[PDB]
Design a binder for this molecule. Structure first.
Ligand SMILES: NC(=O)c1ccc[n+]([C@@H]2O[C@H](COP(=O)([O-])OP(=O)(O)OC[C@H]3O[C@@H](n4cnc5c(N)ncnc54)[C@H](O)[C@@H]3O)[C@@H](O)[C@H]2O)c1
Lengths: 312, 312
């Protein structure tokens, strides 16, 4: 099976391509693509690592050469926030490239699962959906917003706080991928019970994790490595399910039953064709219930903004 | 165990910290250091990955807080080469950085094992030694020049050629870490046989693998991801050995018996005190015999340079 990374030259893309080179299954194929002229050399550098994963790099305006026969297309192209900005600012910046990149996909590998990393996810996914719809090949079970970073961050904070082994904690995270739209279902963390203030303090910390990294890098980029690792966990999950592994569950922003919004991140059962079943968000706590409602308007706005950009 | 990465904000440094954060044994501590102000931000980014490895970053002029208690110190600091340059050409821009870093290691954690990644390793390892000898704390079982990257490139090219599974091949490589001092013992590869010609092409390819990447990145930088992977393997081998594991063997550049030069790279058994035993380079073919000879001049020359730089 072939995986294609769009935006492989940036900080997130390189960390991701490194992880995938070293962790995809023997026999997999990985093609990298980016406008950056360094791109082909990023592949040559990775080609030197001794794993049964064939790698190739392409530069240019045409991504087409690395989308041929692609099964999974991970999109991390774009740019990221510096100190001050939010996640609803570089909009025209990236939305454009997402728009462009999603188009080449539709023409070249419509039936592949597409994972969107480029922020702001809430909006960029909607834009990709509209482009896929417009081109007449949209498969709503094959378009996901990679929100995995919010999951691994919540795992880490819950572990440290409660003194648990970090690999043994998995917290479900629902909603969206930015600020208020990010909701940790802490009431559902087995074996651990929290106090209202911990839930409050933790939720805040989890929602502001990205800012924590920006202020620390003092305007030297945002999270790139952990983002890389997370995108890496998600790509492998997608790849495992596509190969028939059963029981693969990941929360991800997708087009659902519209119960809360056209797009919403909830627990997903993945299978040979992408989303196999959209799990329920389960029983919420008063706090989660409270928080779930107050972010709605914000979420559909992002979605809105996304739809607009394409249809007009 | 505590691992200190010096020069952590560069491309090698960051790819290396990413791999070590997810791969060191639970319980380990990872310290990052670079003069670049972004460094502490890099650690915070990595601190978001849920593994039981505590990580912190430090910036500034003084590496002291990074070095307190380190058991392993990896030095990837310094400038990489530009298209056209050679590994020898980096001596001037890197000698002082190495000198400064190693002195702080000497004052703060003299017992730690030191891995010099900074090129030209043939020369920078010699500088480090003299510096340690002058601080009066040099342990030749504790100072190594990381050449692991020549190994993994060798296992890759050999596998692609002979149709073997990359993970099953281990070609040993001795000499030094440069265009003509890198000698792969293709004759000792258990299982495969090569033709006069094959050995000829493979050998050149392995020796210029570094340039292959610099050229391919067209000025963007040299091997950084394959290099981060190689230094990670080496660092994992060292740590497993410091912990008591047996049978740990890695080729590295160190002060040996002197049979070929003050420093030479050969198979080394690693143990709880650093280099445990330097294994014999074994059986050489006609060709390998020629190579080994052809290069000694350059090597002693390369070492001579690092020495007078500290002495003179
Ligand atoms: N052993 C090998 O196989 C091998 C392979 C490639 C490169 N290298 C060498 O490793 C070094 C690293 O290259 P790179 O690709 O990461 O380059 P890079 O330019 O991308 O990063 C180098 C980093 O060194 C840091 N640095 C410089 N002086 C410092 C000091 N005094 N204290 C702390 N940090 C300092 C810089 O801030 C920078 O982040 C170079 O000397 C390169 O030639 C080794």
């Amino acid at each position: 099976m072939k995986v294609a990374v769009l935006g492989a030259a940036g900080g997130i893309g390189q960390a991701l391509a490194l992880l995938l080179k070293t962790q995809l299954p023997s026999g997999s194929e990985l093609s990298l693509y980016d406008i950056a002229p360094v791109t082909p050399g990023v592949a040559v550098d990775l080609s030197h690592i001794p794993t049964a994963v064939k790698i190739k790099g392409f530069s240019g305006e045409d991504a087409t050469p690395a989308l041929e026969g692609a099964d999974v297309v991970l999109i991390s192209a774009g740019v990221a926030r510096k100190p001050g900005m939010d996640r609803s600012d570089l909009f025209n910046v990236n939305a454009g490239i997402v728009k462009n990149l999603v188009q080449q996909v539709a023409k070249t590998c419509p039936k592949a699962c597409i994972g969107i990393i480029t922020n702001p996810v809430n909006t960029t996914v909607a834009i990709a959906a509209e482009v896929l719809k417009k081109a007449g090949v949209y498969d709503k079970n094959k378009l996901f917003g990679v929100t995995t970073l919010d999951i691994i961050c919540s795992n880490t904070f819950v572990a440290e706080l409660k003194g648990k082994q970090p690999g043994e904690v998995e917290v479900p995270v629902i909603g969206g991928h930015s600020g208020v739209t990010i909701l940790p279902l802490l009431s559902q963390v087995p074996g651990v019970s929290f106090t209202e203030q911990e839930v409050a303090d933790l939720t805040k910390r989890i929602q502001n994790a990205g800012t924590e990294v920006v202020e620390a890098k003092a305007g030297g980029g945002s999270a790139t490595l952990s983002m890389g690792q997370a995108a890496a966990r998600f790509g492998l999950s997608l790849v495992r399910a596509l190969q028939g592994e059963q029981g693969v569950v990941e929360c991800a922003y997708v087009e659902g039953d519209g119960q809360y919004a056209r797009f919403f991140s909830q627990p997903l059962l993945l299978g040979k064709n992408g989303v196999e079943e959209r799990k329920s968000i389960g029983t919420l706590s008063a706090f989660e219930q409270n928080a779930l409602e107050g972010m709605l308007d914000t979420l559909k706005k992002d979605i809105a903004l996304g739809q607009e950009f394409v249809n007009k």
